Write a protein that binds this ligand. Structure first.
Ligand SMILES: [K+]
Ligand SMILES: [K+]
Ligand SMILES: [K+]
Ligand SMILES: [K+]
Ligand SMILES: [K+]
Ligand SMILES: [K+]
Ligand SMILES: [Mg+2]
Lengths: 105, 161, 48, 59, 130, 125, 133, 74
RNA sequence: ACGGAGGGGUACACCAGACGUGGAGUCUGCGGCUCAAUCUGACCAACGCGCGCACCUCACCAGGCCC
RNA sequence: AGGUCUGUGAUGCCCUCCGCCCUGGGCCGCACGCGCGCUACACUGGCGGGGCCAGCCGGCGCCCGCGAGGACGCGAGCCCCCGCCGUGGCCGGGACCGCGGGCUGGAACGCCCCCGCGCACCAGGAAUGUCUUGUAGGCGCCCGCCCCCACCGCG
């Protein structure tokens, strides 16, 4: 369960209703104008909602897009990323690694 | 440790002097003796410099000797400086004898060292270690660190004659 | 056709050669350390 | 063992906080329980300082 | 006068007098506050606000002619910040405590505003002199 | 109207003397107190009014510059008489530093080490 | 008159140490939080440890389970804006294990870079790791 | 009134001009310093060049042409 | 040029000492290992060296414009 | 036949047409062995409050904010003094990690502050380096590269 509200009362009340919540990176980046090439990301994602291969790693995820599958570039390939409730408040670059973990040898 | 190398009359009201005592070979023979001890005291490495604090350290070790021996602290200091310091050394090691200025040097050094080693990692303060060191060297007691060091040096000198 | 140099960044270079690396900006010189050795005679700097 | 303090401690012609600490476990009780012997002045001060204090027996 | 007396006497003898006559008396934020970003704990003597303000006014008296300012007072009470595995560096103290002090000292006519900064007014200058 | 100087490492003590304040603070209260006997040596080894302004340097250097300004100002009111040339010899026969300044100064750091003479650790493997 | 143990919050406080620095024995208390919890509830912060009455313990416990009510601020707290209740909690008991472990299991379900790096028992905070541990 | 600022990097010429302006009727020296490695690459013992440009200024208050001097009235 | 050849000088190279490093954690460089790439130079006189790598720098990888 | 053609419109001869630009990633990835350093192992110390002094040259006033830092305008640390702790890996030591609040910037993965968490380390084997007066050592301060940022180098 999200901070104090259940999924119905932040994903239906207001898109910015969560800002009194999530951390200072979120308030800073949203008290700043989002670049005009990721609004198109939402009028391609939320629009035609009824799998997207994307290329913007730094993009704050906010609740209205929940339960989606995306494929984010990490430099060599697109990696699928699912959307569970706790993903809200984070960026997309934390969910696809650009390095394979070392092993023995 | 002779009268010609222990300077009595040159002292001041506190040992601080700002003197260039080591610009010539034998100049420090006219350096006051309590100031020489003060200079040896601030020789741990984390305490290099910090002379203002060492002057207090020695200053409050003269109100302990006056309260135990009941005599003049400077006099007991002269006695300790004289008693310590090897008279014979070893340098195919053959025996040789030690000059006065080096006897004074090694004496002051070993008193400072004895207090330094006896105060580390202990509740007992370093000033009241200096009191023990000075009062026990001047007598001749085997508990003095300077006297045991002297005895070791003289034994090795004897075994190499 | 209309995307060429959209990225914004300082492209500070040496006033004499053109390199990007090791540029001195103190006092407003804006020349690199290799070119500063030989042009320093007339610019005015001298060793003392 | 307060009675020890009121007589056993009063048998040395000088005393220090560390000395009394090392005689019996008086770690910081030293500072408290010698000021009592100072207000009634069985001992007084001669050389004092924030870090060290030498106390000499009035008697 | 003020310059004569041992500086450590006047400060701690006027801070005890700071409890009389309803002078600057301490506000509530005094708890749970470090006097600086370099300190790692709060002061332990509970009269610390009193002594601090006694000190800051004795600081204002010595600069009789010209004006001090608040930011340049936090610089006066600076300390070095330790325990970081890097070499230690100095930090400016807290301007909120000092500004709180000087605000209440501008009352009771002990200080007067200037072009830039506070100044020791004739009243309060007379008091410290007496 | 007597004007006199005193110098230590970077400290300069300017003394004005008329028939004893240090930076407006009374001399008896010069804060470094275990060295209080040093700033009073010429008095208690040998009044009038003197005014001292000392700037630059550190605590000990400032003390040692006033120790020279004070003793040099009480030598510019006696003149042309045997006292002028004898009190000087009495002052030096205790400490010549009382009359003549100490020339020593900081030496410059040279590249390749933290200090003027200390270099950096050398390794071979 | 004193005791030589306060087996409180399941932690054995020794006594004979100063109570200021005695409270730091409890994992969750610091010297900061302790010096803001004693004076806020009228308790002498430094005389001893084992001379604290029963009523004084009651006052300390009543200010331990609710800091905001007695005026201890949010910025002086440790569970700020938690990811379980959106509230400024105060986790001052040996049951800090559950929340710290939940912050791991959430990562384990979410599969984040932080969680995947924490699994392998590696540095996680940007530090270099070529140095041969 | 009138002000003349004069600035120059060679003390001799500056002094000549300053002398011969008094034939007709704080500003201290500040040093531009640059320290740079002597090598073009970074191989060898690390040695350093210390370059220095010293300037001089005078400010004449009022109520010869030399190439290298700078004068502004303001 | 060299000599476990002789002779004559000399330097904090030694003597008398001081302060260290090598052991702990940690910053940085190097080798190895890994990797789509982890760009490359140097082995007393290489290894906080080639003046501070989010982009740029940029030499390297996955793609994609234009002459 | 140290280094440097990768600092240049210095440059021969080979080879590429590997030029210029945009988005994202790497150069920082880690079982491990080495070089230069930083911080310690405490009482000649740690902490709380006060006092006061530099040089390379150099802005700070007023409100908010625990702080970090913001909106709005104009021309030194050591050390000293007073207390506290009391030989207990303790109030030594501060790595690692968990929430928060900020700054830079198109963008944190960069840096700062707050509460909490409290590693290893008890003076270091075989070896090994530097240094003779304002010198060793201790203490801090400034500039350079620099959107941000020193455990670095020049002072
Ligand atoms: K020079
Ligand atoms: K006890
Ligand atoms: K106690
Ligand atoms: K090199
Ligand atoms: K190097
Ligand atoms: K070249
Ligand atoms: Mg790049």
């Amino acid at each position: 369960n999200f901070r104090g509200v259940e999924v119905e009362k932040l994903a239906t009340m207001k898109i910015t209703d969560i800002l009194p919540k999530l951390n200072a990176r979120c308030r800073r980046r949203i008290g700043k104008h989002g670049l005009s090439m990721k609004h198109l990301r939402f009028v391609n994602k939320l629009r035609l909602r009824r799998i997207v291969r994307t290329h913007l790693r730094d993009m704050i995820i906010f609740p209205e897009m929940i339960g989606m599958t995306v494929s984010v570039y990490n430099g060599r390939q697109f990696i699928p990323v699912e959307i569970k409730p706790p993903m809200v408040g984070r960026a997309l670059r934390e969910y696809s690694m650009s390095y394979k973990i070392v092993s023995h040898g | 440790s002779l009268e010609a190398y222990i300077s009595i009359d040159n002292h001041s009201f506190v040992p601080h002097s700002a003197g260039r005592w080591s610009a010539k070979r034998f100049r420090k023979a006219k350096c006051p003796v309590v100031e020489r001890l003060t200079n040896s005291l601030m020789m741990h490495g984390r305490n290099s410099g910090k002379k203002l604090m060492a002057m207090k350290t020695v200053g409050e070790a003269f109100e302990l000797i006056n309260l135990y021996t009941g005599k003049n602290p400077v006099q007991v200091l002269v006695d300790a400086v004289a008693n310590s310091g090897p008279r014979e050394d070893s340098c195919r090691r053959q025996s040789v004898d030690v000059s006065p200025l080096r006897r004074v040097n090694i004496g002051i050094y070993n008193i400072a060292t004895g207090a330094r080693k006896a105060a580390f990692r202990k509740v007992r303060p370093f000033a009241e270690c200096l009191a023990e060191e000075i009062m026990n060297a001047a007598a001749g007691a085997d508990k003095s660190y300077a006297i045991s060091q002297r005895n070791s040096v003289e034994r090795i000198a004897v075994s190499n004659r | 056709e209309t995307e060429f140099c959209t990225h914004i960044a300082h492209k500070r270079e040496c006033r004499i050669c053109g390199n990007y690396n090791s540029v001195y900006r103190k006092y407003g010189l804006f020349i690199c350390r290799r070119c500063f050795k030989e042009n320093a005679g007339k610019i005015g700097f001298v060793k003392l | 063992a307060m009675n020890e303090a009121l007589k056993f401690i009063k048998n040395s012609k000088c005393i220090t906080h560390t000395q009394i600490c090392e005689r019996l476990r008086v770690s910081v009780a030293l500072a408290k329980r010698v000021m009592r012997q100072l207000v009634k002045s069985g001992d007084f001060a001669i050389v004092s300082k924030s870090s060290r204090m030498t106390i000499f027996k009035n008697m | 006068s003020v310059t004569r007396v041992p500086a450590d006497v006047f400060i701690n003898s006027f801070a005890a007098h700071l409890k009389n006559r309803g002078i600057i008396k301490c506000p509530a934020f005094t708890d749970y506050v470090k006097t600086g970003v370099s300190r790692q704990y709060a002061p332990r003597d509970a009269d610390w606000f009193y002594i601090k303000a006694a000190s800051v006014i004795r600081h204002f008296y010595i600069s009789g002619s010209h004006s001090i300012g608040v930011a340049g007072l936090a610089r006066k009470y600076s300390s070095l910040q330790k325990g970081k595995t890097t070499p230690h560096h100095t930090k400016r103290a807290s301007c909120k405590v000092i500004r709180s002090i000087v605000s209440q000292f501008l009352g009771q006519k002990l200080l007067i505003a200037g072009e830039r900064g506070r100044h020791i007014s004739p009243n309060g200058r007379k008091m410290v002199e007496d | 109207t007597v004007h006199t100087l005193g110098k230590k490492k970077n400290s300069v003590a300017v003394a004005f003397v008329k028939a004893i304040l240090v930076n407006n603070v009374p001399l008896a209260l010069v804060r470094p107190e275990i060295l209080r006997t040093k700033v009073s040596e010429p008095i208690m080894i040998l009044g009038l009014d003197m005014n001292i302004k000392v700037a630059g340097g550190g605590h000990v250097s400032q003390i040692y510059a006033v120790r020279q300004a004070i003793s040099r100002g009480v030598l510019a009111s006696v003149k042309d008489e045997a006292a002028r040339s004898e009190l000087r010899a009495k002052l030096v026969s205790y400490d010549r530093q009382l009359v003549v300044s100490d020339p020593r100064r900081c030496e410059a750091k040279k590249f390749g080490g933290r200090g003027a003479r200390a270099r950096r650790q050398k390794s071979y493997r | 008159d004193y005791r030589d143990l306060l087996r409180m919050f399941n932690t054995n406080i020794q006594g004979k140490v100063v109570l200021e620095c005695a409270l730091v024995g409890i994992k969750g208390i610091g010297r900061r939080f302790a010096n803001v919890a004693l004076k806020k509830a009228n308790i002498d912060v430094h005389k001893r440890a084992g001379e604290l009455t029963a009523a004084e313990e009651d006052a300390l416990m009543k200010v331990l389970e609710d800091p905001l009510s007695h005026g201890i601020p949010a910025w002086m707290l440790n569970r700020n804006n938690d990811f379980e209740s959106g509230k400024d909690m105060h986790i001052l008991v040996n049951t800090i294990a559950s929340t710290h472990r939940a912050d791991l299991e959430r990562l384990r379900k979410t599969r984040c870079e932080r969680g995947v790096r924490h699994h392998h028992n590696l540095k996680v905070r940007g530090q270099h790791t070529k140095s041969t541990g | 009134k009138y002000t003349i600022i004069v600035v120059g990097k060679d003390l001799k010429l500056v002094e000549r001009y300053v002398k011969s302006i008094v034939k007709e009727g704080r500003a201290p020296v500040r040093r531009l310093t640059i320290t740079t490695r002597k090598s073009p690459c970074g191989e060898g013992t690390n040695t350093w060049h210390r370059f220095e440009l010293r300037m001089y200024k005078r400010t004449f208050w009022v109520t010869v042409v030399i190439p290298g001097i700078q004068v502004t009235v303001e």
